[PDB]
Structure 1
Amino acid sequence: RPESELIRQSWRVVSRSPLEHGTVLFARLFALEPSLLPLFQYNGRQFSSPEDSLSSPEFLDHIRKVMLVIDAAVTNVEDLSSLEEYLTSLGRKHRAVGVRLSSFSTVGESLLYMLEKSLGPDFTPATRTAWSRLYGAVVQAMSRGWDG
């Protein structure tokens, strides 16, 4: 496809500073849905405020984990079927930690936000539509983790 090249080219500039960019994604996320904050229980403790998460090594490690999973999607953009199995698993895990399926829509908007802000004039509506499709496919696979 040509959309596959839109994803690859758009990902390049972001992927080289994954923590800085994933920090924008999570900051947006908590701004849209603050009820996600408590889902991150390290040492059984809850973050009071969004800025509390950004001082947590474990939370920042999770940022990196996310950016890695996106990087895998980008890699396999032409053939997403290879990640299905892993993603179904990742969904069940998130079911178990307490994430509701509906929160993945917020996540996706947060991803689109972060790309928009990074790319500026380069984040064309085709680029947006390309990412929305890819994220779509990711969440489809992950939502098999809520039984079916």
Structure 2
Amino acid sequence: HMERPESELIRQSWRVVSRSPLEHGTVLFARLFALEPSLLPLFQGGGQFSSPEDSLSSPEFLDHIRKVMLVIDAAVTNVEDLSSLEEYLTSLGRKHRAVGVRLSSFSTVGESLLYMLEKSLGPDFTPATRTAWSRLYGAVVQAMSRGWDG
């Protein structure tokens, strides 16, 4: 349950972001690392003390930014009803727990998301657009938090 006018604020703004997902994704992660810098070591080359062993164990950053935005894409596609994605999102959450990402970190992503959108859109980031994106992202996180034994 999210109604057409709000779904449409989301579809439109996402269209602008979708012109350049890596560029905007990089803004999201930069804010993210400013807020939680301890997440950096989870990516290939994000360590101060790591060998080339991480390159295969760990995700590469720009590649993973693509994956993040693809998942957000699916959420947008299902903005009006998100239940067909809960299976997946519960599975994705489990993966993030498995490699040491705290649930609390996904809040920091939310802020970073709103920050990216705000930079991306300026006055077009209307209060209703911000609120709707909180609801949408919160719903995504809700589904994902299922993978944390909770």
**Is TM (by shorter chain) over 0.5?**
yes
- Describe the shift of the 1:51–1:120 C-alpha distance in structure 2 as closer, same or farther (beyond 3 A): farther
**2:42 and 2:58 in contact (8 A); partners too:** no
Deviation >2 Å, runs of 4+: 43-57
Q: Write out per-residue CA displacement over residues 21-77 of structure 1, whole angstroms, 9 at most, x where no aligned residue.
A: 101000110011101111225x89658999999999821000000010001000000
User: SS at the partner of 1:46?
Assistant: coil
1:97 CA drift (Å): 1.0
Gapped regions of structure 1 (runs ≥ 5) = none
- Describe the shift of the 1:54–1:17 C-alpha distance in structure 2 as closer, same or farther (beyond 3 A): farther
Q: What CA distance in whole angstroms lies between the structure 2 residues aligned with 1:50 and 1:14? A: 33
Percent of matched pairs sharing the same residue:
99
TM-score computed with the length of structure 2 as normaliser: 0.88
Residues paired across the two proteins, number = 147
TM-score computed with the length of structure 1 as normaliser: 0.89
**1:91 and 1:146 in contact (8 A); partners too:** yes
Gapped regions of structure 2 (runs ≥ 5) = none
**2:43 and 2:59 in contact (8 A); partners too:** no
User: SS at the partner of 2:10?
Assistant: helix
**2:43 and 2:60 in contact (8 A); partners too:** no
- Describe the shift of the 1:32–1:55 C-alpha distance in structure 2 as closer, same or farther (beyond 3 A): farther
